Ligand binder design. Sequence first.
Ligand SMILES: NC(=O)CN1CCN(C(=O)c2ccco2)CC1
Length: 284
Amino acid sequence: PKSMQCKVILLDGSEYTCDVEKRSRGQVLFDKVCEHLNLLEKDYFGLTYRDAENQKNWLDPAKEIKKQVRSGAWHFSFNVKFYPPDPAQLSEDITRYYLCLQLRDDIVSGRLPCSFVTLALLGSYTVQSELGDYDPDECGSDYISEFRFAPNHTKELEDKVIELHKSHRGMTPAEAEMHFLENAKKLSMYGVDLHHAKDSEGVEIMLGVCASGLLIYRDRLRINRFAWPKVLKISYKRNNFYIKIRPGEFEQFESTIGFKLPNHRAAKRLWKVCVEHHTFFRLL
Ligand SMILES: NC(=O)CN1CCN(C(=O)c2ccco2)CC1
């Protein structure tokens, strides 16, 4: 029984290595990573890989690993797939912990934009969770934390993190993690997966996929939003992605919005993430 070595980048930046039989389905490796992580609430998470077009693909747990990674290395990342709209309702603190680690990377990467004050607040809860109570001994007037808090660090941001950290004395890690999430969950780009696209006139837009529905980011004076209820049908053909939108009450026929994606694989990838979000948030 021939086994392939898998390398998985965990959300704390460490590497987990394991072996699976070479014809294994994605679920086999995912189960192994989740067991390693002591993670029970597995539904919110998945494994990604970087392709030959160099983009992120979700590893489909139901399909053979080799038919997905094809010519590529068996190298993966562990990631949040479905961001819970209300993390307080997750049953375990360890689930909330991994969601925090993902969101910290979302913030540092600039995928999740954040005001100065919210960067400092989120940072202050991370420090409280990781170091415990503020201690002046390992913080002078010139202190800079090892923690990455933001896409661009400033001494002002470091100072504000410390000021807010002082206010959290006696907070336990699970409590600080819950505060982090109560703030993060409100950010306008929380849990939004962004895809580059062109509208039916060739104008560059972004399409956002989230729990609630679909977002079309045009010029920022115009953001169109389609709640999952309003979306009739999702489809792709060639480099095109089509959304069928319900008629308003007393209308005879749906509207179709068409988008052009960079290539056929980018269209298929958008289609599959939308179907998965539609299913997941239909059941929540
Ligand atoms: N007064 C309002 O209802 C404002 N509301 C419009 C739609 N909202 C969503 O639930 C959403 C996010 C993506 C698709 O739909 C966000 C903000």
